[PDB]
């Protein structure tokens, strides 16, 4: 009914990038980009993030160049009007897995795997929702048998979601030897997605702290200035020739 | 109409108005803005200069207190006459003159300017 329609509510996890002075865990961003490339890029797309966005955030410039040179993209017409494919450079966006929305829906049973660039800002309680969605592939309750071709997921609105349980224990081999479990993989991929949706978070937080402090000092000065200018008026004595 | 001496609610209302008006040292008639009605303006013109000047002094005192964020001392609050009006009779006379003038074919002696 309405409860299943709106989905089981998502808790409030203590994300490492939460707090007025808190930064992304950049090692976790690197790990999340690894897991996204390994398992999530088959169906989902980003299409808003360039390879150059990873330089200085999770990978070094030569590493990003090699990773871009791995894939090949179609480049515009040459001197004969024909089209051709060249290895991706440091400016190309992440590759798209499907030709278009129609091909995506056809490959995924009519359901369109959403673009993941702004996924954590396109859902209410974004980061917690995404983590809970990925981790909470539970056994459906009693007498609610869902149709074939879907999977039960309490957090998803309606309970029935179209993507299968992807994050499995030992799905990927992390570069730095971190033991890959479902929860760890979910944490890393959600950290990566939250960075992707908001790459300016650290600069924004630093600016906010500095300017709130500075403007607080300005507010004290402005209050003193106003009191000083008004003190010849507020501490004045007037005689008016009237009683009642 | 059962306002005075027979209505508990009206007695409470009068008590509150007395409290507030005496607190700022005003009178009820002083709340009548000349710019509001243009009949208060004529009444204030017709009133004696001593009464008008006392009204202006009370208004200036009230505005001064409102600026300073304070009230009259308890002594002057005690020596207050919030409802010793001075304007109602002249205002009623002016309104009655206006009433007859409009009743039988007359131009208004003054009109509000279009802002």
């Amino acid at each position: 009914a309405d409860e299943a329609e709106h989905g089981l509510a998502c808790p409030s996890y203590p994300w490492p990038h939460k707090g007025i002075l808190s930064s992304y865990d950049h090692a976790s961003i690197r790990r999340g980009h690894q897991v996204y490339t390994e398992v999530c890029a088959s169906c989902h797309s980003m299409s808003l993030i360039s390879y150059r966005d990873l330089v200085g955030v999770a990978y070094t410039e030569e590493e990003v160049k090699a990773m871009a040179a791995e894939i090949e993209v179609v480049d515009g017409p040459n001197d004969e009007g024909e089209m051709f494919t060249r290895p991706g450079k440091l400016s190309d966006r992440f590759p798209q897995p499907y030709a278009n929305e129609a091909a995506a829906r056809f490959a995924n049973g009519g359901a369109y795997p959403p673009d993941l660039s702004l996924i954590t800002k396109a859902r209410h309680n974004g980061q917690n929702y995404v983590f809970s969605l990925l981790t909470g592939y539970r056994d459906p309750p009693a007498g609610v048998s869902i149709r074939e071709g879907l999977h039960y997921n309490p957090y998803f609105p309606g309970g029935a979601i179209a993507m299968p349980k992807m994050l499995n224990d030992g799905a990927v081999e992390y570069e730095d030897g971190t033991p890959a479990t479902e929860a760890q993989m979910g944490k890393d991929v959600v950290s990566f997605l939250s960075w992707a949706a908001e790459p300016e978070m650290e600069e924004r937080k630093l600016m906010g702290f500095k300017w709130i402090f500075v403007l607080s000092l300005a507010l004290l000065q402005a209050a003193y200035y106003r009191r000083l200018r008004w003190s010849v008026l507020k501490s004045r004595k007037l005689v008016l020739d009237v009683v009642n | 109409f059962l306002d005075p001496k027979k209505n508990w609610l009206a007695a409470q209302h009068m008590k509150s108005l007395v409290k507030r008006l005496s607190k700022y040292g005003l009178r009820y008639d002083d709340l009548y803005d000349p710019y509001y009605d243009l009949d208060v303006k004529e009444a204030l013109n017709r009133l004696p200069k001593e009464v008008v000047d006392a009204r202006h002094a009370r208004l200036k005192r009230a505005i001064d207190l409102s600026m300073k964020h304070e009230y009259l001392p308890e002594d002057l609050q005690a020596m207050q006459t919030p409802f010793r009006g001075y304007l109602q009779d002249m205002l009623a006379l002016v309104k009655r003159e206006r009433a007859e003038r409009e009743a039988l074919g007359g131009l208004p002696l003054y009109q509000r300017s279009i802002p």
Partner: peptide
């Protein structure tokens, strides 16, 4: 406590 109507000038006027 408040003065009578005659114990002023504006009040008398």
């Amino acid at each position: 406590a408040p003065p009578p109507p005659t114990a002023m000038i504006y009040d008398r006027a």
